[PDB]
Amino acid sequence: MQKYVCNVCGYEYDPAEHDNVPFDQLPDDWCCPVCGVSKDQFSPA
Numbered sequence: 950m951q952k953y954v955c956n957v958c959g960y961e962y963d964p965a966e967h968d969n970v971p972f973d974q975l976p977d978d979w980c981c982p983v984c985g986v987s988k989d990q991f992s993p994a
């Protein structure tokens with residue numbers, strides 16, 4: 950399962966912690982729960 954990390958605050962998106970929803974399937978209006986940036990500010994781990 951592909952993890953992503955927020956460029957700005959280091960928050961880690963692990964799909965297993967979000968009912969197995971892959972990062973790429975998140976809505977375009979999702980944002981980092983810590984700092985509020987869009988999905989554009991994430992990088993794959």
Ligand SMILES: *c1ccc2c(c1)OCCOCCOCCOCCOCCO2
Binds near residue numbers: 979980985
């Ligand atoms: C995460 C951080 C800040 C947000 C978020 C999410 O908004 C999610 C819902 O967005 C709906 C589309 O945008 C509505 C208005 O956007 C401009 C102001 O948004 C406030 C911050 O929203």
Ligand SMILES: [Fe+3]
Binds near residue numbers: 956957958
């Ligand atoms: Fe963040």
Ligand code: NA
Binds near residue numbers: 951
């Ligand atoms: Na991968």
Ligand code: NA
Binds near residue numbers: 961963966
């Ligand atoms: Na974790």
Ligand code: NA
Binds near residue numbers: 982983
């Ligand atoms: Na938060």
Ligand code: NA
Binds near residue numbers: 987
């Ligand atoms: Na926005």
Ligand code: NA
Binds near residue numbers: 992993994
């Ligand atoms: Na990477």
